[PDB]
Amino acid sequence: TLRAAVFDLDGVLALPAVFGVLGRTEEALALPRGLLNDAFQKGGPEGATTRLMKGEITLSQWIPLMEENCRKCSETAKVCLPKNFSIKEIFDKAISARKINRPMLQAALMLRKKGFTTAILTNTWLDDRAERDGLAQLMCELKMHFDFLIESCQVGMVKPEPQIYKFLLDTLKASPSEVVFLDDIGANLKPARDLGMVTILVQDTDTALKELEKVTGIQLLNTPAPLPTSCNPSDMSHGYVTVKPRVRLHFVELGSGPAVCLCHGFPESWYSWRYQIPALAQAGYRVLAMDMKGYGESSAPPEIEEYCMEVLCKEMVTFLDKLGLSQAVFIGHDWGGMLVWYMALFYPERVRAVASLNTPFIPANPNMSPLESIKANPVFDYQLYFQEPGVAEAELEQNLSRTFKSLFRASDESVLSMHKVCEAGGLFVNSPEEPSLSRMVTEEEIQFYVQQFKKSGFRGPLNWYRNMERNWKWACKSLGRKILIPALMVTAEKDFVLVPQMSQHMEDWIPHLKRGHIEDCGHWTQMDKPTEVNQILIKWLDSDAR
Amino acid sequence: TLRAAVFDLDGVLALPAVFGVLGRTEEALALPRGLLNDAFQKGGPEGATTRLMKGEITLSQWIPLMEENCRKCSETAKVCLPKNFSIKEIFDKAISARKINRPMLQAALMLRKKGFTTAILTNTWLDDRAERDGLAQLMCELKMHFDFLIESCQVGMVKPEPQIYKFLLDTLKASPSEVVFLDDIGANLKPARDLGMVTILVQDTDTALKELEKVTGIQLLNTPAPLPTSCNPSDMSHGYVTVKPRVRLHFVELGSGPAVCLCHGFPESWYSWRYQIPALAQAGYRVLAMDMKGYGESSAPPEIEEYCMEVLCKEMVTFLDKLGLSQAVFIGHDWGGMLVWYMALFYPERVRAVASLNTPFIPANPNMSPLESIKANPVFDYQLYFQEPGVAEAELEQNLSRTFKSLFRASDESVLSMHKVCEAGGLFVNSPEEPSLSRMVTEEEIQFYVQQFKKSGFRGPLNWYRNMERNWKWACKSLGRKILIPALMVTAEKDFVLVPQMSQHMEDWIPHLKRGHIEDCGHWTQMDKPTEVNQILIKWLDSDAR
Ligand SMILES: Cc1ccc(SCC(=O)c2ccc3c(c2)CC(=O)N3)cc1
Ligand SMILES: Cc1ccc(SCC(=O)c2ccc3c(c2)CC(=O)N3)cc1
């Protein structure tokens, strides 16, 4: 039985095939048929192209050798080449236009999800062109999705030589009969078939995928829209900044470009942005996903005042100071959203742009104390139960797995009675001891949050709700200001605490505010609707955050 | 006696003073004298400007209020303002042209070096302009050099109100008689003098500095060229990437912009780039200063083969893969330099540009084994003593302080006999047990390297020299290639192992190679000549690495 799938890059995982450019070029330039492909294949396994693919020479060294083969191929067929003609120009465009074959990637991902060992096997070159980054970016993206990437120029062997195939079996630690091999070049397909491997000639993706699904017995074609790429914690770059003697801040970092700082809510983690981190990095941003003060690998001092908004924001400014960042885009959810609006108001110089998921910006009422204000809405009663130190800590820390499984659920999966929690005398009253697994989460993900909360518990997290009065007084200083820097408000239709209607007057304080709205989305926005969140964020970042 | 110095920003630490723009504008536009300054100061402590400086309103909200005051100031004096006239345009240019007053910064740094508590006290605003980053960048740079930064808009108090002064004493935890206060506005100077503080009216920097040196008793004017800013390890952002199950890589990170990856030599540390990290970040780069495999907080597996060049380079590619970086500029010294040339040769796609300090690129001789090659030069005899496992480890680990103090010395400070170490039967033969402190290093810096080498010792570091044969075979695959990506070779005049002449033929393999040369510079290039290294690197990065 099959347990490994192998794919070529050109014509299989990446389209349009770079080899096809020779054919299009001669047709566009009305040149003799196959003239470009003959110059490209001159000398066979002794010629320029084989040397390049084995890694003997770099692409920049090969460019003039291919041109010499082009003048030799033209003089025989009695033809003239134009003066505007450049081989580098032709290849630059072909490499630049070659994009990932998404349905083929999805199929490769689905096979790996189902236990298959996957690999890319390609005839490639050492790219030293001034424009090499384009391909480095494509390869970097593609490679993370496979167990192995075998490149001809790195192994010094080429397809169709039999050595590379034996090297491929050796890497996969599998018998040829356990391997499906996909290629667009019949010649390169032959030696794999010869060893007894299952082969697929790839012409059109759809047919190749039909051949793949019948041979693996797994549905790969027409399957549902897959979730965005997530994060495996152990494969991330983990960063640590000391902001003051007793306070260190932890973050996960991915990508290059403008710094985007992601701020989670209560009782969350950097992992809460797992579906946004690869997506935002791929979109051209440097993502810094925080473990906010009180959470995960970040310090959790006991004192209530360590979690007032003023202190939290000053510490976030020091975080940028110590990392040498003059600015960052700040994107927050729930308590992170509140932090992010106050970063925009108090430190507009350090905030490139501001975005909030679910959390609206509501100016403090200087006439009404926040305890009065919170009491006026029955949906905010849980926050009053959070006030007394040690009480909610006790309940939420008793069974970590039950806590997260009960919390992290979609709009139609509610198990916790969010009303009259003070009257009921408990947050977990009339709730299962063993809740069902929400469709949003896996057992492993819940267990990641469980392990994270084992270090400091709920004291620091709950303290974020225990500075209602300090936060109110601090907020009153900002009453005459407006948020005039780029801003995005994203509302979640089915969040019954942070309701979309609560954001209705924000235009009065943020006139140029931009918006997004997600239908059928609960409180846990990022994992409830990851695809839409990424769509809205990337669209807004590219237009407003540069 | 004086123990604290306080400086204003505008007109003191930053020039040309932004307040002076009002005067230049009216003179250039041939407008009534003081017209701009009257509109700027309209309503006094009740008007627009005071509100802005206290933080009641942001700069963008103030812009139209100042314009309203400009139409009111012009109608009284019977004058017309042009149609091309914009207040925002005037302030944008004034903020943009305002640069750091380097001699004033040097003086502030020298006072802090001598035990003074230093602070910036300024009347500033909440900057929310599209161009706010310019000032955020200036403030971020300036602030790191002081114990405190008190901003009017953040504290909600302004100069000359007496409250801010009492707030300043409170922050400094010092009596007014212990404080020197520097300001360009006599009015803002008055309340400090009134409390008994030492004051300095700042008109021209030179005179202000003369007044400062006589009052502190420390030479601040005409003093020698200071060393570049260094790194305090505890204030850095520390990053950790797992490249394989048993291998994690540690790095220090600072700045934004293109990623510059710094690779140290033997037996060094990320700290070896201490003088380059702030300088390169300030120059517009994202610096990643590595703890190379075998060093510091990075993993140090015991096996010799874990340190062959192929493995080291593959791990550096995975480092970029896990951080989500398609490329980095690679800058290396000694063994890091060798790694960096092999990164350019084997992975040109992932290398934006390559730079080496001291280490030349020499192609492998396919006819001569590296043991023969190394033997041909008597300066390389220490490398033969490094070959036998456990021998050099024993000597170098016996006294860590003696090891580093003996090694880290300038060209005229040599204490170790580098010749016939095998014949002498020891690396430390006829060398002091307690060497003098080199002028390049402080006791604290040596002790940082001592603490770093306490975790894994010298086995992993020495293993870099123990793959002569594997490295040679691997290098032979690259014999037909050329380095065609941007490249810099920096030679050190007095390095007697890695001599400048050894780099003489590099143009044959790197035709577009760029060069730098540092005279009177030993092996430890970065700490021997930090200023010149930074000059050469920044100049090359800005022209060749974008
Ligand atoms: C028992 C309990 C109740 C509330 C919280 S706060 C975080 C939370 O669970 C939550 C917040 C807002 C919200 C929902 C859950 C569901 C919803 O629609 N809005 C924590 C523990
Ligand atoms: C005892 C000993 C000898 C050599 C080394 S290698 C690093 C080193 O110390 C060094 C390398 C090159 C070099 C100098 C020192 C001085 C110089 O001019 N070139 C380590 C320990």
Swiss-Prot record, chains A, B:
Regulation: Inhibited by 1-(1-acetylpiperidin-4-yl)-3-(4-(trifl uoromethoxy)phenyl)urea (TPAU), 1-cyclohexyl-3-dodecylurea (CDU), 12-(3-adamantan-1-yl-ureido)-dodecanoic acid (AUDA), 1-((3S, 5S, 7S)-adamantan-1-yl)-3-(5-(2-(2-ethoxyethoxy) ethoxy)pentyl)urea (AEPU), N-adamantyl-N[']-cyclohexyl urea (ACU), 4-(((1S, 4S)-4-(3-((3S, 5S, 7S)-adamantan-1-yl) ureido)cyclohexyl)oxy)benzoic acid (c-AUCB), 4-(((1R, 4R)-4-(3-((3S, 5S, 7S)-adamantan-1-yl)ureido)cyclohexyl)oxy)benzoic acid (t-AUCB), 4-(((1R, 4R)-4-(3-(4(trifluoromethoxy)phenyl)ureido)cyclohexyl)oxy)benzoic acid (t-TAUCB) and to a lesser extent by 8-(3-((3S, 5S, 7S)-adamantan-1-yl)ureido) octanoic acid (AUOA).
Modified residues (N6-acetyllysine): K42, K190, K214
Positions of the UniProt region annotated as Phosphatase: 1-223
Post-translational modification: The N-terminus is blocked.
GO MF terms held by the record: 10-hydroxy-9-(phosphonooxy)octadecanoate phosphatase activity; epoxide hydrolase activity; lipid phosphatase activity; lysophosphatidic acid phosphatase activity; magnesium ion binding; phosphatase activity; protein homodimerization activity; toxic substance binding
One GO term of the biological process aspect: response to toxic substance
Outcome when changing C521S: Loss of S-(15-deoxy-Delta12,14-prostaglandin J2-9-yl)cysteine-induced inhibition of epoxide hydrolase activity
SUPFAM superfamilies linked to this entry: alpha/beta-Hydrolases, HAD-like
Induction: By compounds that cause peroxisome proliferation such as clofibrate, tiadenol and fenofibrate.
InterPro entries in the record: AB_hydrolase_1, AB_hydrolase_fold, Epox_hydrolase-like, HAD-like_sf, HAD-SF_hydro_IA, HAD-SF_ppase_IA/epoxid_hydro_N, HAD_sf, PGP-like_dom2
Chain positions recorded as phosphate binding sites: T122, N123
Entry EC no(s): 3.3.2.10, 3.1.3.76
Positions bearing N6-succinyllysine: K54, K420, K454
Keyword Isomerase: no
Domain notes: The N-terminal domain has phosphatase activity. The C-terminal domain has epoxide hydrolase activity.
Subunit structure: Homodimer.
Name of the molecule in the record: Bifunctional epoxide hydrolase 2
Lineage start: Eukaryota, Metazoa, Chordata, Craniata, Vertebrata
Name of the gene encoding the protein in the UniProt record: EPHX2
